[model samples]
Target: KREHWATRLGLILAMAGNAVGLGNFLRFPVQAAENGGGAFMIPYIIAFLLVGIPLMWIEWAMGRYGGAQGHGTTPAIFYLLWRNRFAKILGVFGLWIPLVVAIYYVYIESWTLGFAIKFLVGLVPEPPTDPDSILRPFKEFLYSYIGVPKGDEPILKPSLFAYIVFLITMFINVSILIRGISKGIERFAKIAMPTLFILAVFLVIRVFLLETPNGTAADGLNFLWTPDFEKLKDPGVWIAAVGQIFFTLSLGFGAIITYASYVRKDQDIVLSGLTAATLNEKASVILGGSISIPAAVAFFGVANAVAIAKAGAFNLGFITLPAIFSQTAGGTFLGFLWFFLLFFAGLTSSIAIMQPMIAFLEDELKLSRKHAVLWTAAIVFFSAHLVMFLNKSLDEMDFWAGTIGVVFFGLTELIIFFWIFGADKAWEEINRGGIIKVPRIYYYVMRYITPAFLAVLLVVWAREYEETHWTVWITRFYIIGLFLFLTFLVFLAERRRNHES
Candidate 1:
C-alpha cells in the first residue's frame, strides 16, 4: 500500500536525502575547487534556479496527480497522457529503470561500505610522503577486487569479492524497504538526513581553523570565491554544470516519482520539489565546494587541484575529493569522518535509486512490502554481481547508464509534462503550496527556457560522444533491457487481470 508522508517537512527531507548524496561529498568540492573557486557558485546557482528548480516542480506535480489515482509513475503518466496499450508499455518500462540503475548503484554503495569498514577497522593509514601514496593502496585493493580477466575480448567480466559486497549492501537496502514508506523510509531519512548536515557543518569549521604561514582562513575564503571567466566560456563547463544539476537532483528517474507517490493529496508537491532542489543544490555546492577547493589549495596549491579536477572528469567525487580531504585534514581521523560522511550519503542515495522498483512491485503486482523488497534486492544483487564480475564491461555500462540514461530520461519527462499534460496543470500544482508564488514567467521558462537549454545540451553531449566514441552501444543495450523488462511485466499483469475479469 502507498502511504502518505508524516509531514511536509518529512517529505522535503526525504526528497533532499534522495538528492544530496556522494555527489555533494565527492564531486561538488572538486568542481568548486577547480572552477574558479567561489566563482563556480555563479554558474552552479544559475543552473539550480533556471533548470533544476523548474524541472523538480514539474515532476512533483505529475507525481501527486498519479499518486492520488493510486498508481506508480509510468502508469499514472500513461493514464494522463494516453491510456492505451502502448502507453502502458512505456509506464511499465519506466518502473523497470530503477532496477537497472540499482545494479551498479548498489556496487558503488558497497565501495562506500568497504571504505567505511576500512576506517572502522583502522586500515586507512597516515598521510604518506606523496599524497597519491595514500590513494595507491586503496586503488590496488579496488583493482584486486574488480579487476578484469584476461580473455578473448568479451563484453562483460566480474570480480569475486566485489560481488560479495554487492549482496551485503543489497540485503540492507531491502531490509529497510520492506518496512514500507512511513515507518521505514521516512524514519531513516528523519534521523540520517539531519545527522549528515550537522556533521558537515562541524567538519567545515574544523577545516577552516587549520591555518598556513601566509594563508589564513581569509585566503581559504578568497580561493573559494575567485572566478576564472575562461572556464565560463568552455562548453564543457556549462555542460557539466547542467548535467550535475540534473543527475544530482535525481530528476527524470522514477525515484522522485516513487517518493512523491507517498506524499499526501493535499500537500503541495511543486513547492516541495522546488524547496528540496534548491536546498539540496545550494547546500551541497557551498558546503562541498568550500571544504574541498580551499583546503586543497592550502594543502597541494592551486595547480595540482586544477589538474586533478580535470583528470577526474565527472567522477571527481570518488577520484579526487577523498585524497584531497585525507591530505588536508591529516589523513587518519579526518579520513574516518570524511568517508563516514560519504557512507551515509551513499546509503540514502542508494535507497532513493531503488525506490521505483519497490513501488512497481507493491502497486502493480500487489506483492506485500516484504516480498517486493526482498525480491527486488535479490534480483539486484545477482544482476549487479554479474556486472561486477566483468570490470571493463561494468565501466562501459556505467558510462552508458550514467550519462545517456539520465539525459534521455530527463528529456522524456519534459515532453510528458509540458507538451502532453499541458503547462497549466503543472503550474497550478507548483503555485498551490508555494512559500513564494511562482511567476507566470516560469511557464515560459518551462515551455521555452528550460527545454531549449536541455535540448542544446543534449546535442553538445551527442557531439562529445561522437568525438570521444563513447560507449553508445552499451547504452543501447541498457535502454533495450529496461524497455523489454517493463514490457514483459505489463504483459504478465494485463494477462492476469484479463483472466480474473
Candidate 2:
C-alpha cells in the first residue's frame, strides 16, 4: 500500500523539516547581509509573500489533486489540465531538477557528517584564520581535510575517503525511505527536527555571548539586520535575493508538491503553505541570518562573510561556517552541534527530493515502494558520485542546476498552475476541506503578480549571469536544447503508447 501520513501535523512537520535545511541557517544570513544589508529584506519579504507563498500553495493544491486522483505530477495534473500529450513531457524536465539537485546535495551532506565527526572527537580546532593566531596547525588540518584546490593546482576530486562518506550518508537516507513513510520518514522527522531546533537555540545563545559593542560580532549583526537601500539599484542583489528565497525554501521545484501530496485531505493547505513558507523564510532570513551573520561577524566580519557568500552558497556552508565555528568558544562542541543540525536537515531534504519519483513510480507505473526506492536511490547515488568527481567544474554544474534549472522549473510550475489549471480552480483546491479559506486576493497574485515578477527576475538574473563570464547566449541555448531534447523523448514515448493502444 502507498503510505499516507498519520496526521496533518506530522505531514506539516515532515514537509517543513524537508523545506528547512542547512540552507535556512547556513546560507540565508550570508545572502541577506551580502545582497543589501537591511534593504534586501524589502525584496526578500515581498518575494516570500507575493511569490514564494503563492507558489507553495499552488504546489500543495496540485499535489493533493494529483494524489486524490491516484496519480503523480505528470500523468495527474499535467495530463489532466492540458489533456495534451505534449504536456506530459514537462514531467521529465520537472523530475530532472530535483534528481540533479539531490545528486550534488548529497556531496555537501557528506561534508557535514565529516565536520560533525571532527567536532565530537575534539580534533576540530578553534578559529585559526587570525594572523596572530597560535592554532595554525588546526587551521592547516581543516584545510587539508576539506579544502578545494587553488591556482595552478591539479583538479581536486572527492578523495576515496570522501566517497565512502558520501555512500554512508546516501545509504542512511535510502535505507530509511525504503522502509516506508510512517516508520522511516515520520520517525526521522519526529526526532531530527526537534533535535535540530534545540541545537540551533543553544548555538544562538552562544553567538550572543560573542557579541561585543565594538567587535566584528556587532558589525556582523548590523550588516544583516540594518537596511541599506544603496544595494537596491544593483540588479544582481535583487536577483540573488529572489533566487535565494526560491532555492532555500525548495520552492519552484516540485519537491514541495511531492511532500504535500501526502498531506491529509482535511489539512488546511493554505495555512500549511503559509506556515511552511513563513517558517522557512524566517528561519532562513531572520533566524538563519541572525545566527550566521553574527557568528561570521564575530570571526570573519561583514566583509569576508559577504565575499564567501557571493563566492558560492556551499562555500559559505562548508568552508566559512566551519571556520567560524572553529574560532568560537566551545569550538568542538559547537562545531559538532552545528554540523549535526545540518546533517539531519540535509537528510530530511534528501528524502523529500527522492520521494517524488518514488511516488510517481508507485502511482503511475504500479511499482512497489521497495523497488522504487532501490532504483531511484541507486541512480541518484551514482549520479552524485559523478558530480563529486567533477568538482573542478562545479561552477558549471551550479550555473545549470542552481540558476537555470531552478528558474526554468519554477516558471513551468507557475504557468501550469495559473494558465493551464485556471487560477480559480487552483485556489479552490488549495482551500479544499480546510479550516481557513484561501483569500480571494491570492487568485490575482497567482494569475498576474507572481508570473510577471518571476519573468522580470529571470531576465535580470540572466544578465548578471552573462557579466560573470560563466555563460552566454550559447550556453543558455544549450540548456534550452537539453531541456527540449528531454521533453521530446518523453513526448515520443507517450505518443507511441497512445498509438499502440
Candidate 3:
C-alpha cells in the first residue's frame, strides 16, 4: 500500500514545492516591508523557530507514520494519534482547511496565468512615465479584471475573462490530481520548482540593478533591512510575523502532512523537511523580499515603496510590480516573466493544497483518483464562484482559513503528533533515518514551546476577533457548513472502515 516518491530529489522538490508559495513572492515582502522592515524579520525569525520549524518536522514524521499504517489523510491519522472516535471529527480541519484555501488560491492562480498571457499578447499597456499617475492604470485594470470594486460603484461583477481563466486553472490542477503522486506532483515539481528558483534569481538581479532616477535599488534594500527597533515593541508586529510564516511555509493546512504520507518508512524527514523549508525561505526571504519592494523603491522611492507595500500584497505585485516593469525597456517581457514565475510558484503550491482532501477521498471514501479529482474540482469550482462575485467573500475566507484556521489546526497537529503520540517517541520518530541530528534542543522546543506559543496566538486572536458584517458572517456560515459536510463524510467513511473487519 505504500506509494513512495520516485527519487530523493523529486521528494525534496515536491515537499519544497508545497512550502514555496505565492506568499513567498507576493506576501513576504509586503509583510516584511510593512511591519517596520527588519523589525518584522526579528520576530519573524523567532516565530519560525518557535512554530514553523517544529511543524515541518512533526508533519513530515507524522506523514510517514500515518502512511505506513495505511492511512494517507488526517481522518485516519487523527484516529491514529488518539484511538478516540472524536479525533476523527477534528480530522475534518486537516481535510477542510486545505480545500477551502485551494478554492480561492486556484482562483488567484488563474489571475497570475491570465496576467502573464495579458502581458504576452500586448493587452497590458506600457508602464506609466508620469509621476502623479504611477500605478493608476494598472490599478484600474486589476480592479476590473478581478471584479474588485473601487470600494463603491454598483458592487462590481467578475468579468467573462476572470470566470473562464478560473475554469482553465482548475482543469489544469485536476488533470494533475488524476495522475497519482509519483507521476504527477513529483514530476511537475522537478521542473516547475527549479524553474521557479531560476526565475526568482533572474528577477531579483534585474530589480536590484534598476537604478532609476526616482531612487536607487540600494536605497530600497536599506529601507527594507534598516531596523526600526521601536516597531518590534508592538505585540501586533510579532503576531503578524507569525502569521506570515503560517502562509509562507504552507503550515497547518495539512498539505505538508498529506505530502509526508506518501513517503517510505525510512524517509529522512528531519533533514528533508529542513531542506524543503529552507528552500522556501530562499525563494521568499531572500528572493521574494528582494524583487518587488526594491523595484518599487527604485521606481517610486522608499516612502512610495512603503506605501505600495502597505496597500497590500496584490497592489505590490499585481499593481505595483507591473507598473514598475512598464518603465523598463523590456517592460512587457519582464512583466510576463514575473507573472509567469508567480503562476509557477502558485501552481506548485495550489496542486499540493488540494491533495489533502483528494487523499482523504481516495483513502477513506475509497474513491478512484479520477473520481476524487473531478468531484472535488466540481466542488472547488462552484465554491470558487462565491469568492468571485460576492463582496468580502475572499477576505472572509482568508481571515478564517489563512489568519485563524491554520493556527488552530496547527496546534492540533502538535498536540496529536507530538504530545499524544508521546514526546520521547516523537523525538525518536523525528530523528529516525535522519542524516543530520536535529538538535536535542528542538525536542524540548517542539514538545513544549511550539504548542504553547500557538495556544497563546489563538488567545490573542480571540481577544482581538470581532466581526459583524453581513458578507463576513455569511462566509463564516458557509465555512461552518462546509466543515459539517466534511464531518458527515468522515463519519460514513470511518463507519465503513470499521465494518470491513
Candidate 4:
C-alpha cells in the first residue's frame, strides 16, 4: 500500500515550503537589484505565467497520475507513461539533479544554522563605526566557521561548530523523512511555513521603518520597485527574470513531483498548486524583496549595494546582511530572526529535495522507508563532505547540478509528456479532479510555448557558459558516472520486475 497526504492543507503547505527556499530570501533580492529592479518583475510575471505555472500544473498532474499507478520516481513514471526504454533513461535526470543539488544546498543551509547560533550566543561583535570595516571580521568569521582558509594560511581543520551544525541539519532532515510524508514533512511545514511568513512580515515592517545613514526608506524602496523601461530591451534581463522565476518556484527539481505524488487521487490540485505558487511568490517578491535589498540600499547606498550584489548570493546573505544587521537598532534580536528565517527556509527545501531519492529507493528497490531513508542520508552526507571544504568543488557542482541540470530535466520532461505522451492525454490528467478549470489556452502553451521558452533559455545559458578550470571536467565526470550507475540500477530493477511478471 502507498502512503498518501493526511490532509489537503498539509499538502499545500508542504508544497509551498518546498518552493519557499533560500532563493526566495537570498537569491531573489540580488537578482532583482542586478537586473532592472522593479522593472525585472515585468519579465518575471510574464515568465511565471508562461513557464512557472504551466510546469507546476504539469509536474503535479504527472506525479499524481504516477502515484495512482504506484510509481514515484521519474524514471518509473516516464516508463509508465511512454512504455519506452529511452523515456526511462531520460527520467534519470530527475533523480540525479535533486540528489546532487541537495548535497551542496545542505552545506549552505548548515551555514545559516551556524550563524544563527553565533548571533544568539553573542559571538557576533558590534559593528565598527566605519562601514568599510565589516569585511575583515566577516572574512575572518567565514574562515573560522566554514573552514575555508585565507591566503598564505595552512589548511585548517573543519570547524567543530560547522560539523555539529551540519550533522544537526542532516539529522533534522532525515528525521522528518523517516516519519513518512504527513506526520513528518507536512507537520513540520505546518509550523515552519506559517512561522516563516510571520517572521518575514515582521522583518519587512522593520525594514520599512529603518532609518539608514545614507538614504531614506523611499530611496531603498525605489531601488527595488522603481521600474526602468530601458532594461526591458535587454535579453539578459529577460533571461535573468526567467531564471529567477525557475529558481524561486523550485520547479524542474523533481522535488515538486515527489511531493505531489503523495497527493490523494481526488484532491483538487489546481487550487492547491496555484495557492502554493502564490504564497511562494509573495514570500519572494513582497517579503524577500522588501527586506533585503531595501535594507542594504538604505544603509549602504546604491554604489556599495551594487558591489555587494556582485559579491555572490552567499556573501550577500551570510556576510553582508549580518554586517548590516549588527549596526541596526535591536540588531541582536533581528539578526537572530534573519538567520533563523533562512534556516527555516533552507530546512524546508532540503527535505523536499531529498524526497526524490528516497521515493525512488522505496518505489523501485522495494526497500522499507527506514532503510531507504538511511541509504539516501548516507549518500548525501558523504557526497556533501567533498564540497564542504572546497569552494571550487562546490561552485562546479552547483553550476552543473543545480543550474544547467534543472533546465535540462525540465525541458526533457515537457517534451516527453506533451509530445511523446500526448498533450491531449496530459490535459485530461490535469483536469481530472481539479476544482478550478485550467484554461484551454494552456494546452497550446504547454505544447509549444513552454518548450520554446525553455529551449531559448537553455541556449542563452549555454552560450554564456565559460569553463573555469580542470575542476569543471572533474565535476562533469563525477556527474556522468553517477548517472550511469543509477541508470544501471534502474535497468536491473526493471529486469527483475519483468522476470517476476
Residue 264 miss distance in model 4 (angstroms): 1.4
Per-model C-alpha lDDT, please?
0.69, 0.70, 0.85, 0.85
Ordered by TM-score, highest first, the candidates read 3, 4, 2, 1
lDDT of 3 by residue, 1-501 (tens): 756799999999998889888889888888888887878888998898888898889889888889888787887898888888878888788888898898789999999999998999989854435754867888887888887766654254778887788888888898777787989999899999889988888998988789978888888788777778898778789789998888889898989988998888987888889999888877787888889888988887888788878877699889888887887888888999999999999998999989888888888888888888888888899888778887778877888887788989889978987888788888888888898978888988898888888888789888864444556766788888999999999988978988986
Q: Give one digit per residue, the lDDT tens place, for model 2 in 214-328.
A: 3555677677767777777877777877787778778756688777666656667877777777667656655566666777666655676676567665555555566656555
Output the worst ten-in-a-row residue range by lDDT, candidate 1. Answer: 312-321
Evaluate residue 344 in candidate 4 and report its C-alpha lDDT on the 0 to 100 scale: 96
TM-score of 1: 0.88
Error of 1 at 34 (Å): 5.5
Q: Return the lDDT, model 3, position 352.
A: 93
TM-score of 2: 0.89
Between candidates 1 and 3, name the one with more favorable lDDT: 3
TM-score of each: 0.88, 0.89, 0.97, 0.97
Error of 3 at 307 (Å): 1.1
Task: After the best TM-score superposition of candidate 3, give how far the Cα of residue 183 lies from its true spot, in angstroms.
Answer: 0.7
Displacement of the residue 335 alpha carbon in candidate 3, Å? 0.5
Instruction: List the candidate 1 regions with Cα displacement exceeding 4 Å.
Output: 33-40, 84-86, 126-135, 148-163, 211-224, 313-330, 432-436, 466-479, 497-501
Decreasing lDDT order of the candidates: 3, 4, 2, 1
What are the C-alpha RMSDs, in order, of all predicted structures? 3.4, 3.5, 1.5, 1.7
Q: Is candidate 2 or candidate 3 better by lDDT?
A: 3
